Write a protein that holds these residues in place. Structure first.
Motif, PDB file in Angstrom:
ATOM      1  N   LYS A 412       0.818  -1.176   0.003  1.00  0.00           N
ATOM      2  CA  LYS A 412      -0.039   0.202   0.071  1.00  0.00           C
ATOM      3  C   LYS A 412       0.753   1.275  -0.045  1.00  0.00           C
ATOM      4  O   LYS A 412       0.358   2.267  -0.395  1.00  0.00           O
ATOM      5  CB  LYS A 412      -0.899   0.015   1.199  1.00  0.00           C
ATOM      6  CG  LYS A 412      -2.051  -1.197   1.383  1.00  0.00           C
ATOM      7  CD  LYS A 412      -2.655  -1.224   2.830  1.00  0.00           C
ATOM      8  CE  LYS A 412      -3.562  -2.220   2.521  1.00  0.00           C
ATOM      9  NZ  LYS A 412      -4.243  -2.599   4.026  1.00  0.00           N
ATOM     10  N   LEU A 413       2.060   1.006   0.374  1.00  0.00           N
ATOM     11  CA  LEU A 413       2.877   2.408   0.448  1.00  0.00           C
ATOM     12  C   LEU A 413       3.147   3.066  -0.779  1.00  0.00           C
ATOM     13  O   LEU A 413       3.208   2.198  -1.825  1.00  0.00           O
ATOM     14  CB  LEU A 413       4.385   1.907   1.149  1.00  0.00           C
ATOM     15  CG  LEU A 413       4.435   1.223   2.478  1.00  0.00           C
ATOM     16  CD1 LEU A 413       5.889   0.806   2.713  1.00  0.00           C
ATOM     17  CD2 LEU A 413       3.978   2.432   3.563  1.00  0.00           C
ATOM     18  N   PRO A 414       3.315   4.413  -0.891  1.00  0.00           N
ATOM     19  CA  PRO A 414       3.561   4.942  -2.026  1.00  0.00           C
ATOM     20  C   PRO A 414       4.975   4.682  -2.759  1.00  0.00           C
ATOM     21  O   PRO A 414       5.701   4.492  -2.107  1.00  0.00           O
ATOM     22  CB  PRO A 414       3.518   6.526  -1.770  1.00  0.00           C
ATOM     23  CG  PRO A 414       3.707   6.606  -0.250  1.00  0.00           C
ATOM     24  CD  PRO A 414       3.158   5.396   0.337  1.00  0.00           C
ATOM     25  N   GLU A 415       4.927   4.808  -3.846  1.00  0.00           N
ATOM     26  CA  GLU A 415       6.107   4.478  -4.768  1.00  0.00           C
ATOM     27  C   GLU A 415       7.472   5.208  -4.378  1.00  0.00           C
ATOM     28  O   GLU A 415       8.464   4.702  -3.927  1.00  0.00           O
ATOM     29  CB  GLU A 415       6.010   4.701  -6.292  1.00  0.00           C
ATOM     30  CG  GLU A 415       4.720   4.332  -6.856  1.00  0.00           C
ATOM     31  CD  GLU A 415       4.670   4.463  -8.140  1.00  0.00           C
ATOM     32  OE1 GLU A 415       5.048   5.706  -8.668  1.00  0.00           O
ATOM     33  OE2 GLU A 415       4.366   3.520  -9.002  1.00  0.00           O
ATOM     34  N   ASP A 416       7.119   6.556  -4.132  1.00  0.00           N
ATOM     35  CA  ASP A 416       8.199   7.431  -3.659  1.00  0.00           C
ATOM     36  C   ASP A 416       8.742   7.248  -2.060  1.00  0.00           C
ATOM     37  O   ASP A 416       9.664   8.080  -1.659  1.00  0.00           O
ATOM     38  CB  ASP A 416       7.938   8.909  -4.141  1.00  0.00           C
ATOM     39  CG  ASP A 416       6.873   9.455  -3.140  1.00  0.00           C
ATOM     40  OD1 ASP A 416       5.759   8.613  -3.172  1.00  0.00           O
ATOM     41  OD2 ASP A 416       7.276  10.732  -2.854  1.00  0.00           O
ATOM     42  N   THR A 417       8.060   6.321  -1.469  1.00  0.00           N
ATOM     43  CA  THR A 417       8.582   6.081   0.116  1.00  0.00           C
ATOM     44  C   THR A 417      10.037   5.895  -0.077  1.00  0.00           C
ATOM     45  O   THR A 417      10.635   5.002  -0.583  1.00  0.00           O
ATOM     46  CB  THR A 417       7.840   4.962   0.543  1.00  0.00           C
ATOM     47  OG1 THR A 417       6.392   5.148   0.545  1.00  0.00           O
ATOM     48  CG2 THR A 417       8.204   4.721   1.951  1.00  0.00           C
ATOM     49  N   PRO A 418      10.875   6.745   0.554  1.00  0.00           N
ATOM     50  CA  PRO A 418      12.189   6.649   0.930  1.00  0.00           C
ATOM     51  C   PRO A 418      12.314   5.539   1.744  1.00  0.00           C
ATOM     52  O   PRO A 418      12.931   5.720   2.918  1.00  0.00           O
ATOM     53  CB  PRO A 418      12.471   8.001   1.509  1.00  0.00           C
ATOM     54  CG  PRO A 418      11.317   8.339   2.440  1.00  0.00           C
ATOM     55  CD  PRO A 418      10.238   7.679   1.660  1.00  0.00           C
ATOM     56  N   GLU A 433      28.128  -2.061  -1.978  1.00  0.00           N
ATOM     57  CA  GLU A 433      27.361  -1.304  -2.763  1.00  0.00           C
ATOM     58  C   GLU A 433      26.037  -1.869  -1.927  1.00  0.00           C
ATOM     59  O   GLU A 433      25.800  -2.917  -1.844  1.00  0.00           O
ATOM     60  CB  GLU A 433      27.030  -1.428  -4.020  1.00  0.00           C
ATOM     61  CG  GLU A 433      25.661  -1.427  -4.532  1.00  0.00           C
ATOM     62  CD  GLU A 433      25.317  -1.754  -5.966  1.00  0.00           C
ATOM     63  OE1 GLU A 433      24.187  -1.919  -6.618  1.00  0.00           O
ATOM     64  OE2 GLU A 433      26.426  -2.115  -6.471  1.00  0.00           O
ATOM     65  N   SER A 434      25.073  -1.062  -1.519  1.00  0.00           N
ATOM     66  CA  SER A 434      23.819  -1.415  -1.010  1.00  0.00           C
ATOM     67  C   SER A 434      22.810  -0.271  -1.577  1.00  0.00           C
ATOM     68  O   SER A 434      22.674   0.778  -1.029  1.00  0.00           O
ATOM     69  CB  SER A 434      23.870  -1.487   0.717  1.00  0.00           C
ATOM     70  OG  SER A 434      22.719  -1.669   1.193  1.00  0.00           O
ATOM     71  N   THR A 435      21.691  -0.819  -2.499  1.00  0.00           N
ATOM     72  CA  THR A 435      20.817   0.011  -2.867  1.00  0.00           C
ATOM     73  C   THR A 435      19.503  -0.614  -2.684  1.00  0.00           C
ATOM     74  O   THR A 435      19.239  -1.551  -2.780  1.00  0.00           O
ATOM     75  CB  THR A 435      21.177   0.406  -4.185  1.00  0.00           C
ATOM     76  OG1 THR A 435      20.863  -0.638  -5.293  1.00  0.00           O
ATOM     77  CG2 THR A 435      22.491   0.978  -4.390  1.00  0.00           C
ATOM     78  N   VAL A 436      18.357   0.354  -2.660  1.00  0.00           N
ATOM     79  CA  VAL A 436      17.046   0.103  -2.683  1.00  0.00           C
ATOM     80  C   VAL A 436      16.125   0.688  -3.518  1.00  0.00           C
ATOM     81  O   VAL A 436      16.310   1.853  -3.496  1.00  0.00           O
ATOM     82  CB  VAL A 436      16.424   0.275  -1.153  1.00  0.00           C
ATOM     83  CG1 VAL A 436      15.057  -0.063  -0.773  1.00  0.00           C
ATOM     84  CG2 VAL A 436      17.416  -0.601  -0.171  1.00  0.00           C
ATOM     85  N   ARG A 437      15.356  -0.017  -4.203  1.00  0.00           N
ATOM     86  CA  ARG A 437      14.604   0.555  -5.281  1.00  0.00           C
ATOM     87  C   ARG A 437      13.227   0.033  -5.341  1.00  0.00           C
ATOM     88  O   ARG A 437      12.883  -1.157  -4.677  1.00  0.00           O
ATOM     89  CB  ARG A 437      15.142   0.742  -6.720  1.00  0.00           C
ATOM     90  CG  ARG A 437      15.167  -1.060  -7.266  1.00  0.00           C
ATOM     91  CD  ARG A 437      16.173  -0.764  -8.434  1.00  0.00           C
ATOM     92  NE  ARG A 437      15.269  -0.092  -9.576  1.00  0.00           N
ATOM     93  CZ  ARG A 437      15.690  -0.045 -10.998  1.00  0.00           C
ATOM     94  NH1 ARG A 437      16.860  -0.611 -11.269  1.00  0.00           N
ATOM     95  NH2 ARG A 437      15.087   0.723 -11.767  1.00  0.00           N
ATOM     96  N   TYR A 438      12.321   0.886  -5.566  1.00  0.00           N
ATOM     97  CA  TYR A 438      10.841   0.337  -5.654  1.00  0.00           C
ATOM     98  C   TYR A 438      10.690  -0.569  -6.917  1.00  0.00           C
ATOM     99  O   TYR A 438      11.033  -0.574  -7.862  1.00  0.00           O
ATOM    100  CB  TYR A 438       9.793   1.450  -5.906  1.00  0.00           C
ATOM    101  CG  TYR A 438       8.187   1.068  -5.899  1.00  0.00           C
ATOM    102  CD1 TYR A 438       7.785   0.508  -4.776  1.00  0.00           C
ATOM    103  CD2 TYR A 438       7.441   1.257  -7.186  1.00  0.00           C
ATOM    104  CE1 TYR A 438       6.210   0.321  -5.009  1.00  0.00           C
ATOM    105  CE2 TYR A 438       6.350   0.900  -6.995  1.00  0.00           C
ATOM    106  CZ  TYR A 438       5.556   0.405  -6.004  1.00  0.00           C
ATOM    107  OH  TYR A 438       4.515   0.212  -6.060  1.00  0.00           O
TER     108      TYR A 438
END
Ligand code: NA
Length: 490
Positions: A412-418, A433-438
């Motif tokens: 339910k969280l919005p895409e742009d949720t940081p 490296e450690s990255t998080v993306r929707y």
């Protein structure tokens, strides 16, 4: 009749020297054994008005000792006598004189869990103190045990066994079946009361009273045993049309302090023992997350339909560890995964231990997790640089993991949720490296971790959890890169 009747017998055995069981099997090739089949027309209670039915296993091969089975009616305790008439043998002897000392090897429970006109198996109690259980639409997968002793210790594991059972005759209206069991082992004994409740999930209620006949290095409470050959976290080295092959792919734990932990399973080159120390565990289980048939592709074994097993303690179990044992295997034919709760301290021999818990055999993994805490749907290993796809790229010492999270609240969280990631790694490794993306496809978040191993001959452990700014959004991905896993050679 109650657990006390059995406990009394257990206490008695615990106060005497252990009697090593003696084989009673005469002259057998596996092929022949597969010929001994239970005559379905002989199901126990086939004449009674009750949805539950019983069938029995025949001795042979390594099932060289019998188990005694009794029925508990409203007025009596009747011993269910062994008879070759319960089975068909075709090609094997089975003379009323050659099977004179034989008994049942074990038993199974039948119930119309899938359809009214079919009595399908829902429980199989056979070998040591092992038993298999399934819910509706499921296929046999992992096993549970009444108890485990010294598992993974160099001195050698000790396998207790259920020597006698007391199954009470259910009322025509009953939806539950009660089974009592007496457990005996060189250094331990026990009394169990099982309450099997079939359904979408078949839930088994367990109460036990354990007695040590003597001190033991390690006691495993509410053990589970599964199997993991390969998966996206460690793909099959040999070509296989099956993308994955396993009965479970991770150990899930609801820690004493509320944290959810997920330890993806491995098939290490060397015996691996992982211990999660804590006090008063809230729950743990071997799960099978990801049930789309395309992950398996196997029409005969249907791993996609095999149960997850979740153990829920009733009460505070105190100080100890939810332990995971991973055993090297080249075949899916033998289980290589063991999990259980082992207490830090045990009481003096002869002293009674009480353990109450339920084991849920399910295919609804999301329901075995807190709704406001995201879980790992899958873990995919990849060469260092996830952008790169070149086929002839030479190892650069780094390795990456694509970890996908999803959940009821996360969806339910919005895409742009940081969404951020709290990471950590042992001394043998380094997070490059450690990255998080929707992930717009899943409506969840994807973590990409790239780490470099200092010594490929040593074990490497890392952790990661999705966080938001204000809170923790997911369980803690607790991964272990087995020793010699990322080592190049020849
Ligand atoms: Na797919």
């Amino acid at each position: 009749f109650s657990i006390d009747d059995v406990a009394k017998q257990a206490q008695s055995l615990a106060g005497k020297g252990y009697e090593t069981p003696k084989s009673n099997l005469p002259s057998m090739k596996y092929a022949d054994y597969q010929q001994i089949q239970f005559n379905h027309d002989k199901a126990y209670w086939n004449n009674l008005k009750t949805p539950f039915k019983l069938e029995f296993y025949h001795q042979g091969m390594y099932f060289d000792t019998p188990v005694k089975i009794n029925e508990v009616t409203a007025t009596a305790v009747k011993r269910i006598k062994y008879s070759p008439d319960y089975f068909t043998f075709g090609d094997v002897q089975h003379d009323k004189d050659t099977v004179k000392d034989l008994g049942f090897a074990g038993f199974k429970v039948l119930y119309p869990i899938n359809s009214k006109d079919k009595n399908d198996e829902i429980v199989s109690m056979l070998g040591a103190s092992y038993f298999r259980v399934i819910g509706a639409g499921q296929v046999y997968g992992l096993s549970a045990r009444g108890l485990a002793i010294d598992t993974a210790l160099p001195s050698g594991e000790e396998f207790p066994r259920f020597k006698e059972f007391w199954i009470e005759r259910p009322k025509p209206t009953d939806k539950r079946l009660t089974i009592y069991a007496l457990l005996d082992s060189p250094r331990a004994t026990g009394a169990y009361k099982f309450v099997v409740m079939p359904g979408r999930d078949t839930v088994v209620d367990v109460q036990s009273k354990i007695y040590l006949r003597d001190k033991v290095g390690k006691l495993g409470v509410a053990p589970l045993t599964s199997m993991f050959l390969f998966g996206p976290n460690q793909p099959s080295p040999a070509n296989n049309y099956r993308p994955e092959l396993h009965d479970s792919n991770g150990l899930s734990i609801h820690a004493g302090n509320g944290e959810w932990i997920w330890r993806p399973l491995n098939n290490p080159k060397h015996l691996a023992v992982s211990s999660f120390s804590m006090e008063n565990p809230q729950g743990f289980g071997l799960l099978q997350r990801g049930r789309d048939f395309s992950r398996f592709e196997d029409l005969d074994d249907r791993y996609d339909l095999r149960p997850s097993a979740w153990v829920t303690p009733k009460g505070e179990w105190g100080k100890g560890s939810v332990e995971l044992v991973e055993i090297p295997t080249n075949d899916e034919t033998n289980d290589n995964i063991v999990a259980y709760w082992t207490p830090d301290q045990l009481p003096e021999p002869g002293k009674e231990m009480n353990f109450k818990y339920t084991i849920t055999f399910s295919r609804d993994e999301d329901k075995l997790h807190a709704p406001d805490n995201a879980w790992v749907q899958q873990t995919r290993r990849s060469t260092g640089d996830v952008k790169q796809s070149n086929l002839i790229r030479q190892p650069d010492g780094t390795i990456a993991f694509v970890v996908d999270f999803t959940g009821a609240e996360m969806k339910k969280l919005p895409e742009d949720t940081p969404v951020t990631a709290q990471t950590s790694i042992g001394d043998n490794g380094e997070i490059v490296e450690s990255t998080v993306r929707y992930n717009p496809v899943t409506k969840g978040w994807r973590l990409v971790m790239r780490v470099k191993v200092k010594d490929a001959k040593k074990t490497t452990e890392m952790r990661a959890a999705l966080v938001n700014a204000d809170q923790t959004l997911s369980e803690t991905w607790s991964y272990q890169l087995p020793a010699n896993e990322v080592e190049h050679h020849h």
